[PDB]
A paper describes a structure:
[name] is a type III receptor tyrosine kinase expressed on microglia and macrophages. Colony-stimulating factor 1 receptor ([name]) is a key signaling node in microglia and macrophage biology. In particular, [name] signaling modulates proliferation, migration, differentiation, and survival of microglia and macrophages in health and disease. Upon CSF1 ligand binding, [name] dimerizes and undergoes receptor auto-phosphorylation.
To alter the harmful neuroinflammatory response in progressive MS, we generated a small-molecule [name] inhibitor with activity against both mouse and human [name]. Specifically, we developed (S)-4-(3-((2-(6-methoxypyridin-3-yl)-2,3-dihydrobenzo[b] dioxin-6-yl)methyl)-3H-imidazo [4,5-b]pyridin-6-yl)-2-methylbut-3-yn-2-amine (sCSF1Rinh) as a result of a structure-based discovery effort aimed at the identification of potent and selective [name] inhibitors. sCSF1Rinh, is a type II kinase inhibitor, that binds to [name] in a DFG-out conformation. The compound makes a key hydrogen bond interaction to hinge-region residue Cys-666 through N-3 of the imidazo[4,5-b]pyridine ring. The benzodioxane moiety occupies an allosteric pocket adjacent to the ATP binding site, and a second key hydrogen bond interaction is made between O-1 of the benzodioxane ring and Asp-796 of the DFG motif. The alkynylamine function located on the imidazo[4,5-b]pyridine ring extends from the ATP pocket into solvent-exposed space. The binding specificity of sCSF1Rinh was assessed in an active site-directed competition binding assay (KINOMEscan) to measure the interactions between sCSF1Rinh and 450 human kinases and disease-relevant mutant variants. sCSF1Rinh is highly selective for [name] as compared to other kinases with a selectivity score of S(35) = 0.005. Furthermore, sCSF1Rinh exhibited excellent pharmacokinetic properties including good oral bioavailability and CNS penetrance, which makes it amenable for both in vitro and in vivo experiments. A short pulse of CSF1 stimulation induced robust [name] and ERK1/2 phosphorylation, which was inhibited in the presence of the sCSF1Rinh. We observed similar findings in murine primary microglia and bone marrow-derived macrophages (data not shown) as well as with IL-34 stimulation. Together these data not only show how the kinase activity of [name] regulates both its own internalization and degradation, but also demonstrate that sCSF1Rinh effectively inhibits [name] signal transduction downstream of the receptor. To interrogate the role of [name] in this MS mouse model as well as in macrophage and microglia biology, we developed a novel kinase inhibitor that is potent, selective, and amenable to in vivo experiments.
Residue numbers in the entry: 559 to 679, 753 to 813, 817 to 847, 849 to 917
The structure:
């Protein structure tokens, strides 16, 4: 499959990415938490060609210390080593010198998917494929994502979906989908919950939950509270039912992804292929 020659969370920053903040006028804030945020902006003469364009910049709020200010650099560092892919929110550059860290990304003009679906309560299949392609890539670099969900999928011009992660620019603290456990429990594989284990095979599970998000944006395990009862349910192998708008084949993928044995679950490679077949038949 893929061999990892190096791990990017232990590599230093690559200064080829650096871009000068003076060619950057902040537009509107796009999203924010209690430790950092994300805001529209125009980068003057970006890339190896002197072209202006629209971007998003992630950055710390006032309230950051060695915990978060590092975790932004980690994200920066990890990101400099994946490099581009149409189905991913790509790093364009950074500002790491002469001020707090500014991480400049593609601006995805239609924002998060969970809202794009909730808004609108073959198109559903493209989204699934595109997200699947993006994860197959992250998988090919042995990069575990840990927060695969519709809230973290973005929609650029021509409704192409790219995986991302809002990280510090999301109010995780005031978001009931993230449970305090001395975590987005409804999206997590059992090995991730019970045993703090986190693989690409876990991310397939979470990618299962994302497909069920074909419910056109429903909260998983609808009306089920996260508590003793919910953990037993998922260990004893309970599965959400088929969504209304799911083709049977597609629910077969979800049930595949929600296999309790991590190895019995498929790979982003397989899913992309099964998705490719089901495309011309539609
Ligand atoms: C594991 O790999 C990755 C890949 C990308 C990322 C990061 C990159 O930084 C990001 C930056 C963004 C921010 N972003 C880009 N276009 C955006 C558009 C909006 C919006 C909106 C509207 C439609 C106007 N309401 C909000 N945030 C945007 C979203 C996801 C990110 O994921 C993290 N890990």
């Amino acid at each position: 499959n893929s061999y990892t020659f190096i791990d990017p969370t232990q590599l230093p920053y690559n200064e080829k990415w650096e871009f000068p903040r003076n060619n950057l006028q902040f537009g509107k804030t796009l999203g924010a938490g209690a430790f950092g945020k994300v805001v529209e902006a125009t980068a003057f003469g970006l890339g190896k060609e002197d072209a202006v364009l629209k971007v998003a910049v992630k950055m710390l709020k006032s309230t950051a210390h060695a915990d978060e200010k590092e975790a932004l650099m980690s994200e920066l560092k990890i990101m400099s080593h994946l490099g581009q892919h149409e189905n991913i929110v790509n790093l364009l550059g950074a500002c790491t010198h002469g001020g707090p860290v500014l991480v400049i990304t593609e601006y995805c003009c239609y924002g998060d998917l969970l809202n794009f679906l909730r808004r609108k309560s073959r198109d559903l299949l493209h989204f699934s494929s595109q997200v699947a392609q993006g994860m197959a890539f992250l998988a090919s670099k042995n990069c575990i994502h840990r927060d695969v969900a519709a809230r973290n999928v973005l929609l650029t011009n021509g409704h192409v979906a790219k995986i991302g992660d809002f990280g510090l620019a999301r109010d995780i603290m005031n978001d009931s989908n993230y449970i305090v456990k001395g975590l987005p429990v409804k999206w997590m594989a059992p090995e991730s919950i019970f045993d703090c284990v986190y693989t690409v095979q876990s991310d397939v599970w979470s990618y299962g939950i994302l497909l069920w998000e074909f419910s056109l944006g429903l909260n998983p395990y609808p009306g089920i509270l996260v508590n003793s009862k919910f953990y037993k349910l998922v260990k004893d192998g309970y599965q959400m039912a088929q969504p209304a708008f799911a083709p049977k084949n597609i629910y077969s993928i979800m049930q595949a992804c929600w296999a309790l044995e991590p190895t019995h679950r498929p790979t982003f490679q397989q899913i992309c292929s099964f998705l490719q077949e089901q495309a011309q038949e539609d």
